[PDB]
Amino acid sequence: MNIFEMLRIDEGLRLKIYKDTEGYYTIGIGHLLTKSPSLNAAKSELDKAIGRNTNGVIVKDEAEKLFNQDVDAAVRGILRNAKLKPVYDSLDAVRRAALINMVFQMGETGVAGFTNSLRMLQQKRWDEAAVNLAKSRWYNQTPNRAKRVITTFRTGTWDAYK
Ligand SMILES: [Cl-]
Ligand SMILES: [Cl-]
Numbered sequence: 001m002n003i004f005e006m007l008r009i010d011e012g013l014r015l016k017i018y019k020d021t022e023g024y025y026t027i028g029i030g031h032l033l034t035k036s037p038s039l040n041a042a043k044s045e046l047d048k049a050i051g052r053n054t055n056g057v058i059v060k061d062e063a064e065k066l067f068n069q070d071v072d073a074a075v076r077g078i079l080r081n082a083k084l085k086p087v088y089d090s091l092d093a094v095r096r097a098a099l100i101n102m103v104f105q106m107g108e109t110g111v112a113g114f115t116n117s118l119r120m121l122q123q124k125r126w127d128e129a130a131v132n133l134a135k136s137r138w139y140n141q142t143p144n145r146a147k148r149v150i151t152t153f154r155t156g157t158w159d160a161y162k
Contacts, residue, residue: 001158003071003097007104009161010145013063017042017056021142027056028063030104031070074100077108084112090122098152105145106138121153130154 011030017039020026025033025042033045043056050062078084078099088096099121102111112118114136120129130150133139139146148160 001161003100004067006097006158006161007067007071007101010101010105010148013060015058015060015063017046027058027066029067029070031063031066070104071100074104078103081108081112083115083118084108087118087122090124092156094156094158095121095153098149101149101152102138126154126156 008029013029014027017025017027017033020030020032024035025039025045027033027046031049033042033049036042039056043054046056046058047054049066050058078088084099084103088099091099099111114133117129117132120132130153133150133153134146136146139150151160152158
């Protein structure tokens with residue numbers, strides 16, 4: 001298992017514009033298009049993102065390409081972030097995948113706000129971090145995915161994904 005396969009399980013793949021769990025226009029493998037209610041604003045962003053007139057639909061390769069950019073940006077955002085970097089540097093390979101996943105879903109800003117959990121992760125207090133991570137809107141809104149990520153943090157293994 002690796003970050004790509006992990007996120008592909010959590011996000012799914014859709015070749016036509018769809019609405020995410022929050023109701024926003026998304027396409028491919030969790031690629032957020034816009035927070036705007038307009039389907040046209042969404043089609044516009046999509047065409048801009050792909051470099052062609054897509055009429056709201058893309059092929060697998062296009063979805064994969066977006067996904068490759070998005071993971072890359074997630075990692076780079078973590079490395080550029082003063083609060084996230086030290087956490088990431090301190091973690092083992094599996095757990096790093098768990099942080100990348102949160103970042104991809106919720107953005108650098110949002111993860112960076114989990115101040116207390118971040119401090120627990122850095123200290124390697126697994127069980128406590130898992131408890132603290134659960135007291136969040138994140139966990140209440142997408143409990144199955146949150147549980148998988150949290151288990152990854154607690155255990156340091158890919159069990160929740162097998
Ligand atoms: Cl883009
Ligand atoms: Cl869920």
